[PDB]
């Protein structure tokens, strides 16, 4: 699915892709560089930088809705990560 992040499952928060085609939410592949340099953490591929902003990615996700998995309330896909920071079924099932 064109909308989640290849290295926490969860759907893109600001949604960066990197020379070697994978898509990842932008802090998610900093730190994942942070930790191990000029890798990409799905394929190994060499990443000189962690990539470009997904701007066509970014776009889409404006005009999609799905369920949050966890409360089944219809979100907004460009707002799905401020929706978990706040959903409380969310926080139950997976902490703070
Ligand atoms: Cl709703
Ligand atoms: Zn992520
Ligand atoms: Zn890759
Ligand atoms: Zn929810």
């Known amino acids: 699915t064109s909308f989640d992040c290849a290295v926490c499952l969860e759907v893109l928060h600001q949604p960066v892709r990197t020379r070697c085609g994978h898509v990842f939410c932008r ?3 900093a730190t994942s560089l942070k930790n191990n340099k000029w ?4 394929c190994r591929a060499y990443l000189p930088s962690e990539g470009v902003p997904a701007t066509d990615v970014a776009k ?3 005009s999609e809705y799905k369920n949050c998995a966890e409360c089944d309330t219809l979100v907004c896909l460009s707002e799905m990560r401020a929706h978990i ?3 409380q079924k969310y926080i139950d ?3 703070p």
């Open 27 to 29: 802090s998610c592949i």
């Open 39 to 42: 890798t990409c953490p799905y």
């Open 60 to 62: 889409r996700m404006k």
């Open 85 to 87: 920071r706040t959903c």
């Open 93 to 95: 099932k997976y902490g």
